[PDB]
Amino acid sequence: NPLIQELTQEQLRTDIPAFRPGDTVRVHAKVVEGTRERIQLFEGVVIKRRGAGISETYTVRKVSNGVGVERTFPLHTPRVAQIEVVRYGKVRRAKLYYLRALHGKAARIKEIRR
């Protein structure tokens, strides 16, 4: 553990804002369609945070054009310019898998303003 931790500490980002499942974040994802590179904003609710150290990931869920879409990112990926916290949600559990079954008004999360 300590040795693997030391090998990877160099690549941990330090610009991670404090966010937890249920918060709404805007993820600034770098996309490449060829030579050019671009930022595509994926905004939605964090439904999952798992792992530790360099292997930590999180999942953001949004409903686009009627279809639920989940994106999982490595927390420390350089391919994400910025993780922006839009709103703080009030939830009661670490994993928000139950939102997958809900839609529209039922899937709403109350803001808490941390």
Partner RNA sequence: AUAGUGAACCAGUACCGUGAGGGAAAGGUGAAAAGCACCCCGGAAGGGGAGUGAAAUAGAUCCUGAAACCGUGUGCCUACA
Partner RNA sequence: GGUAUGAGUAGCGAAAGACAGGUGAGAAUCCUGUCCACCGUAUGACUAAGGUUUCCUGGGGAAGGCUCGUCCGCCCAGGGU
Partner RNA sequence: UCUCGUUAAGGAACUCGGCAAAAUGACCCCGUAACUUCGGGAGAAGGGGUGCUGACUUCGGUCAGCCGCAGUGAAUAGGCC
Partner RNA sequence: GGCACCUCGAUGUCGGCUCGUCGCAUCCUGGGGCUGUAGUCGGUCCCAAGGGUUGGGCUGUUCGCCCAUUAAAGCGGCACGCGAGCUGGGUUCAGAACGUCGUGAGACAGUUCGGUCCCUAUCCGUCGCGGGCGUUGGAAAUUUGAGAGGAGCUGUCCUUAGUACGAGAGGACCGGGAUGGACUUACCGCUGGUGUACCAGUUGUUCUGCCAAGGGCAUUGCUGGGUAGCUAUGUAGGGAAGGGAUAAACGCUGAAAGCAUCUAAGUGUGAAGCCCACCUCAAGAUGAGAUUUCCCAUUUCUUUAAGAAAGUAAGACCCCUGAGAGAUGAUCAGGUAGAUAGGUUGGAAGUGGAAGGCUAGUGAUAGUUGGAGCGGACCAAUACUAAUCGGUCGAGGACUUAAC
**Residues at the site binding RNA, with contacts judged by CB under 7 A:** 1-2, 18, 20, 48-52, 55, 57, 59, 72, 90-95, 97-98
Choices 15-23, 75-83, 90-98, 104-112 (CB under 8 A): range interacting with another protein: 75-83
Closest CA relative to residue 28, chosen from 11, 15, 12: 15
Which residue, chain included where needed, has tokens 């927390």?
A: 75
By C-beta, is 63 or 107 nearer to RNA?
Answer: 107
Which of 14, 15, 18, 33 lies at the binding interface for another protein (CB under 8 A)?
33
Establish if 68 lies at the interface with another protein (CB under 8 A).
yes
- Cα end-to-end distance, the chain, whole Å: 33
Using left for φ > 0, alpha for ψ between -120 and 50, and beta otherwise, residue 22 falls in left
Choices 14-22, 24-32, 81-89, 105-113 (CB under 8 A): range interacting with another protein: 24-32
Which residue, chain included where needed, has tokens 């941390």?
A: 114
Closest CA relative to residue 108, chosen from 41, 63, 75: 63
Establish if 43 lies at the interface with another protein (CB under 8 A).
no
Establish if 96 lies at the interface with another protein (CB under 8 A).
no
Establish if 84 lies at the interface with another protein (CB under 8 A).
no
Tell me which DSSP letter residue 66 carries.
Answer: T
